[PDB]
Amino acid sequence: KELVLALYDYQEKSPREVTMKKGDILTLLNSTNKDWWKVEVGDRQGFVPAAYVKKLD
């Protein structure tokens, strides 16, 4: 889908989560949830706080 920019670093805390580093460019996979967005960071998928990323589009 679209691309989002990681505004903050985020280390996963649950099995469904994924780690990211500020500055990273992730592929937005599912933004149906207002609190967690499924993204692809590098070569891995998972959820990160919707609030910590920004849509570029």
UniProtKB/Swiss-Prot annotation:
Signal peptide: none
SH3 domain residues: 1-57
Superkingdom as given in the UniProt entry: Eukaryota
Localisation: Cytoplasm, Cytoskeleton; Cytoplasm, Cell cortex
Summary of subunit composition and partner proteins: Like erythrocyte spectrin, the spectrin-like proteins are capable of forming dimers which can further associate to tetramers. Interacts with ACP1.
Similarity field: Belongs to the spectrin family.
Function: Morphologically, spectrin-like proteins appear to be related to spectrin, showing a flexible rod-like structure. They can bind actin but seem to differ in their calmodulin-binding activity. In nonerythroid tissues, spectrins, in association with some other proteins, may play an important role in membrane organization.
Protein name in UniProt: Spectrin alpha chain, non-erythrocytic 1
Source species: Gallus gallus
Residues included from the entire protein: 969 to 1025 of 2477
